[PDB]
Design a protein around this ligand. Sequence first.
Ligand SMILES: [Zn+2]
Lengths: 207, 102, 76, 186, 187
Amino acid sequence: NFNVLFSTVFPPTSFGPLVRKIFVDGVPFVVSTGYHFRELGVVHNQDVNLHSSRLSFKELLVYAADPAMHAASGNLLLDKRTTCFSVAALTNNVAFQTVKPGNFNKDFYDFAVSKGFFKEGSSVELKHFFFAQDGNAAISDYDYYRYNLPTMCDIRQLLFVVEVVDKYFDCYDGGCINANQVIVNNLDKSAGFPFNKWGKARLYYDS
Amino acid sequence: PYPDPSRILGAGCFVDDIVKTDGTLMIERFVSLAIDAYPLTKHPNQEYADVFHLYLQYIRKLHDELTGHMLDMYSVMLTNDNTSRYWEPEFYEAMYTPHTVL
Amino acid sequence: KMSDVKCTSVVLLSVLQQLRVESSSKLWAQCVQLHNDILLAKDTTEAFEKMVSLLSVLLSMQGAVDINKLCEEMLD
Amino acid sequence: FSSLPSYAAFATAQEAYEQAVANGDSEVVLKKLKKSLNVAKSEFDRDAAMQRKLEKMADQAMTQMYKQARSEDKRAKVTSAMQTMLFTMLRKLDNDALNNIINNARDGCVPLNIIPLTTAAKLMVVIPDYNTYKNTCDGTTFTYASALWEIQQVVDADSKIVQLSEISMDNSPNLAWPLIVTALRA
Amino acid sequence: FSSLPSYAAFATAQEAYEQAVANGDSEVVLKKLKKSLNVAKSEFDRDAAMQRKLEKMADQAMTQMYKQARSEDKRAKVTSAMQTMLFTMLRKLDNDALNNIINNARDGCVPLNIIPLTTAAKLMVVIPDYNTYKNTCDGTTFTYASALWEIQQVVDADSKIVQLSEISMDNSPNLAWPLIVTALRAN
RNA sequence: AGCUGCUCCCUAGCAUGCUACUACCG
RNA sequence: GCGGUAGUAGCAUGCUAGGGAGCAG
Ligand SMILES: [Zn+2]
């Protein structure tokens, strides 16, 4: 709670991952080794090793998900459409994504009109549709994070509310489980950047 | 519980794929949408029960028009293997009565 | 008669979309605005003038849909 | 399914036992038909089952094939069905302004930009021959989309001004004809 | 399933029963050669029903290890993909500006948000309207983030090249209007 | 191109369970 | 005459797996 108040004073380029240079068989990388949170302070990793020999499947998986080497090798970006902090541009051009209209099932509509629907003054009418969007739809929707502001709490009131709220959750039981006990519905969904260049979640749960 | 009638009718008229604009290819979409619309039959407003009745009539029409294709374009005689339960109200009334079958 | 104008607007925007109109960003923006404002109208005198201006777009692109045989296939 | 081989055997056994119960002599000489017969129902119900559900399996395979064929041939014809649909729907709407602009476009007069709605703002229309110029433009007032527009400037296909009273019958074969009128809404 | 050890045995039992049926002598003819047949019952039940289970289990096993071989190949494929990507983005990175800022850090660590801000060679700006254009990057060189930049190329929302003379207050309504400016760091 | 929950339809399989016919021994 | 087991056929209930679809946050 105190960190939230004190962190509004310091420059916003000082928060985020902290990077370092390591060597993989004599070739230098740039990887994350910590984090500076606005709420939790400075955190340092416990297993960091310069000069490793190879990379397993797991270490490649961890280095590919890191934003360190994606952002350290792109262009600088000054996006003036938002007030949010922009970091880097990962290509040479901007992408403008649209949304399409719906499809009209004319057979059902004709059948329904031959049974007396959609008359003048009826109580049932059409108000649900597929609305279309133009190229500036994604960034204008991302710009709604300007409503998130730093909020400091009444701490002595919160430390009591949390106990009562915890009393609401007493009948359940939890804990950790192993990898052969977890259940996935629909292993045919996306894996999410950069992993959607090579397969779906099935590929990574099988490999 | 019952839904807004405009939601069900809109799910009938507007779709997100061109294949779903032919009814005889799926039919199950309309069976599910008719499950969702059964409790409107008990409403005091008469233009609300007509939605459930319209769905049942459309399901029957689609079944007939699918079966009357295999007898002409081909020479296949389809038998009504108890597919007549879908255009009667008992199959749908059973989903809101307390004795499960999930 | 409001229902018909709304359904026709949906079909119109589908035709315009598959005629490769979103390769011009300003034209596509105007078309999307007209479509979305027809779908929200509550007065059948605005919807028809907006439909007039939205069909003018397809009629501008001469040499992309052949207007004659379509109007003579059976229906106008 | 009765045209099957073991039908004859089963029918023979059951007719023999019908005779045996209509004669009623022994208990195991009549059990002959039953030691003899339960074999008939062990080789007729064992063969009047597999083909009976095979009859349904075949019909369900052919319905699946038909559905895949129809599904794949529906999405190879989107941009002909869509335009045919649009024009039937526009015909049954039966609006005066839409019919005006559609008939004009069918005979040659098309716009060059979106039709404006404000009482200000400009409209440009291509006019391809004298005959279609008679019906719409008379004086300095234009009749289009069931409205009235006031002419401001006419230029030729040579991109040079032509004064308005020049356009008439005799001088029509003197101008590269696809002119462009420019009008503002009244 | 005909080359089993008991096909011959049930065959000879029924063949002797056929021989005696062509004979038809005694009550023991019936009893015996329905029990020569009624012994060759277990043969052709277990030897033709345990042979009907081992084969299903063998097919199960073969299909399963087919699956495992394919899953083992796709793993190597994706491993190669990830390695090539990492080593490819490695070679736009190892400059001297990077080492210069890294060696000025007291313990080796730096924030990640200041690496493109201080070492990148190219800048991209996205402009919503002309009023913003006048206040950010008018001219042919401008200063951003404590450095000097030099414009090369301007494109619009359709990815078409604009020339710097067209961008004006009265030509503004004729442009597709997010413009994207590309500049290079001046030395 | 996400995370969850519920419901309908179709096929495969497993054991189980009920039920019917044949054989053997007791 | 009955029991036990071994086979073969038909029927239900439950569980798992796979595919198709619908709604809600
Ligand atoms: Zn734990």
